[PDB]
Design a protein around this motif. Sequence first.
Motif, PDB file in Angstrom:
ATOM      1  N   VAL A  33       0.762  -1.358   0.021  1.00 27.86           N
ATOM      2  CA  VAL A  33      -0.102  -0.039  -0.191  1.00 27.86           C
ATOM      3  C   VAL A  33       0.597   1.231   0.194  1.00 27.86           C
ATOM      4  N   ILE A  34       0.413   2.490  -0.528  1.00 29.62           N
ATOM      5  CA  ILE A  34       0.649   3.716  -0.586  1.00 29.62           C
ATOM      6  C   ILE A  34      -0.125   4.240   0.443  1.00 29.62           C
ATOM      7  N   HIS A  35       0.128   5.273   1.285  1.00 27.41           N
ATOM      8  CA  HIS A  35      -0.476   5.846   2.396  1.00 27.41           C
ATOM      9  C   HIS A  35       0.091   7.102   2.944  1.00 27.41           C
ATOM     10  N   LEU A  36      -0.853   8.020   3.307  1.00 23.73           N
ATOM     11  CA  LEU A  36      -0.545   9.300   3.910  1.00 23.73           C
ATOM     12  C   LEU A  36      -0.051   9.462   5.485  1.00 23.73           C
ATOM     13  N   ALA A  37       1.016   9.940   5.786  1.00 25.31           N
ATOM     14  CA  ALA A  37       1.332  10.348   7.065  1.00 25.31           C
ATOM     15  C   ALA A  37       1.087  12.002   7.245  1.00 25.31           C
ATOM     16  N   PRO A  38      -0.092  12.435   8.043  1.00 20.96           N
ATOM     17  CA  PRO A  38      -0.423  13.779   8.075  1.00 20.96           C
ATOM     18  C   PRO A  38       0.391  14.924   8.483  1.00 20.96           C
ATOM     19  N   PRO A  39       0.062  16.056   8.366  1.00 20.71           N
ATOM     20  CA  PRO A  39       0.903  17.395   8.689  1.00 20.71           C
ATOM     21  C   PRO A  39       0.829  17.695  10.335  1.00 20.71           C
ATOM     22  N   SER A  40       0.221  16.731  11.059  1.00 21.68           N
ATOM     23  CA  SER A  40       0.057  16.757  12.507  1.00 21.68           C
ATOM     24  C   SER A  40       0.243  15.536  13.157  1.00 21.68           C
ATOM     25  N   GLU A  41       0.892  15.660  14.301  1.00 23.91           N
ATOM     26  CA  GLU A  41       1.295  14.547  15.438  1.00 23.91           C
ATOM     27  C   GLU A  41      -0.016  14.263  16.151  1.00 23.91           C
ATOM     28  N   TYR A  42      -0.071  12.844  16.883  1.00 25.07           N
ATOM     29  CA  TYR A  42      -0.928  12.421  17.929  1.00 25.07           C
ATOM     30  C   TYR A  42      -0.733  13.336  19.135  1.00 25.07           C
ATOM     31  N   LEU A  54       1.342  19.939  18.150  1.00 20.56           N
ATOM     32  CA  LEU A  54       1.372  18.859  17.100  1.00 20.56           C
ATOM     33  C   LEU A  54       1.577  19.228  15.839  1.00 20.56           C
ATOM     34  N   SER A  55       2.023  20.537  15.453  1.00 18.85           N
ATOM     35  CA  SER A  55       2.378  21.095  14.108  1.00 18.85           C
ATOM     36  C   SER A  55       3.367  20.359  13.528  1.00 18.85           C
ATOM     37  N   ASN A  56       3.279  19.554  12.059  1.00 17.63           N
ATOM     38  CA  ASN A  56       4.440  19.191  11.252  1.00 17.63           C
ATOM     39  C   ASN A  56       4.198  19.177   9.908  1.00 17.63           C
ATOM     40  N   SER A  57       4.718  18.303   8.981  1.00 18.26           N
ATOM     41  CA  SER A  57       4.535  18.314   7.669  1.00 18.26           C
ATOM     42  C   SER A  57       4.150  17.044   6.995  1.00 18.26           C
ATOM     43  N   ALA A  58       3.537  16.989   6.104  1.00 15.42           N
ATOM     44  CA  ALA A  58       2.853  15.708   5.450  1.00 15.42           C
ATOM     45  C   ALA A  58       3.755  14.969   4.517  1.00 15.42           C
ATOM     46  N   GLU A  59       3.750  13.748   4.663  1.00 17.03           N
ATOM     47  CA  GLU A  59       4.597  12.808   3.772  1.00 17.03           C
ATOM     48  C   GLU A  59       3.657  11.631   3.093  1.00 17.03           C
ATOM     49  N   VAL A  60       3.716  11.177   1.802  1.00 18.84           N
ATOM     50  CA  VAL A  60       3.234  10.072   1.136  1.00 18.84           C
ATOM     51  C   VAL A  60       4.282   8.913   1.217  1.00 18.84           C
ATOM     52  N   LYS A  61       3.922   7.681   1.965  1.00 19.61           N
ATOM     53  CA  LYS A  61       4.820   6.809   2.242  1.00 19.61           C
ATOM     54  C   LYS A  61       4.246   5.201   1.720  1.00 19.61           C
ATOM     55  N   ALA A  96       0.221   6.399  -7.908  1.00 15.14           N
ATOM     56  CA  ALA A  96       0.435   5.938  -6.528  1.00 15.14           C
ATOM     57  C   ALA A  96       2.223   5.525  -6.397  1.00 15.14           C
ATOM     58  N   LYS A  97       2.544   4.933  -7.191  1.00 14.71           N
ATOM     59  CA  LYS A  97       4.276   4.729  -7.349  1.00 14.71           C
ATOM     60  C   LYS A  97       5.040   5.918  -7.907  1.00 14.71           C
ATOM     61  N   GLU A  98       4.248   6.936  -8.406  1.00 10.60           N
ATOM     62  CA  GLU A  98       4.929   8.343  -8.577  1.00 10.60           C
ATOM     63  C   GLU A  98       4.601   9.349  -7.482  1.00 10.60           C
ATOM     64  N   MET A  99       3.736   9.285  -6.730  1.00  9.08           N
ATOM     65  CA  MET A  99       3.354   9.860  -5.254  1.00  9.08           C
ATOM     66  C   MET A  99       4.028   9.394  -4.252  1.00  9.08           C
ATOM     67  N   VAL A 100       4.552   8.011  -4.002  1.00 10.70           N
ATOM     68  CA  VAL A 100       5.456   7.905  -3.012  1.00 10.70           C
ATOM     69  C   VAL A 100       6.490   8.827  -3.035  1.00 10.70           C
ATOM     70  N   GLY A 101       6.578   9.236  -1.946  1.00  8.24           N
ATOM     71  CA  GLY A 101       7.735  10.389  -1.421  1.00  8.24           C
ATOM     72  C   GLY A 101       7.425  11.870  -1.332  1.00  8.24           C
ATOM     73  N   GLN A 102       6.112  12.236  -1.850  1.00  3.70           N
ATOM     74  CA  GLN A 102       5.591  13.375  -2.046  1.00  3.70           C
ATOM     75  C   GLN A 102       5.143  13.794  -0.638  1.00  3.70           C
ATOM     76  N   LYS A 103       5.207  15.217  -0.577  1.00  5.17           N
ATOM     77  CA  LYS A 103       5.173  15.999   0.693  1.00  5.17           C
ATOM     78  C   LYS A 103       4.256  17.187   0.246  1.00  5.17           C
ATOM     79  N   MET A 104       3.558  17.592   1.465  1.00 14.59           N
ATOM     80  CA  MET A 104       2.295  18.596   1.709  1.00 14.59           C
ATOM     81  C   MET A 104       2.429  19.491   2.823  1.00 14.59           C
ATOM     82  N   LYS A 105       1.777  20.614   2.988  1.00 10.28           N
ATOM     83  CA  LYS A 105       2.017  21.421   4.120  1.00 10.28           C
ATOM     84  C   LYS A 105       0.850  22.491   4.207  1.00 10.28           C
ATOM     85  N   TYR A 106       0.488  23.108   3.141  1.00  8.63           N
ATOM     86  CA  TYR A 106      -0.537  24.294   3.157  1.00  8.63           C
ATOM     87  C   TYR A 106      -2.162  24.044   3.482  1.00  8.63           C
TER      88      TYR A 106
END
Length: 125
Positions: A33-42, A54-61, A96-106
């Motif tokens: 699977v390809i999945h999102l790590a959100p721009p916020s912590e627990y 809890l502020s952070n940056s998003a990553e596709v993993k 999805a295999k192109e979106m692997v490693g992409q990052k987001m913030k806004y």
Amino acid sequence: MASPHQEPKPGDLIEIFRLGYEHWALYIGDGYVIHLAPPSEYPGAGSSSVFSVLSNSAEVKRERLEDVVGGCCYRVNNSLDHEYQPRPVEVIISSAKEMVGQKMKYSIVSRNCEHFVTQLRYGKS
């Protein structure tokens, strides 16, 4: 049900109750699977230097289904495909295999999730 578990379909997307929040994932292979790590912590970080922030940056993993599902609940929920689209399944897996490693913030977490699964589709949307 008669089945031992829910079966995700290749190139379709899965709603994952990963945490104290709902994530998305895309089934790119048989067990992968390809999945999102959100721009916020627990919430409640637990460190003597920081708890409430809890502020952070998003990553596709990239990860295994059994890890993304381990200790978690899930459901196949391909919203825009259920609403209309026919969808080129191989080009979604390729995207999805192109979106692997992409990052987001806004964007905020709820839209950061939707904008991720719109970029996973992006084809017939």
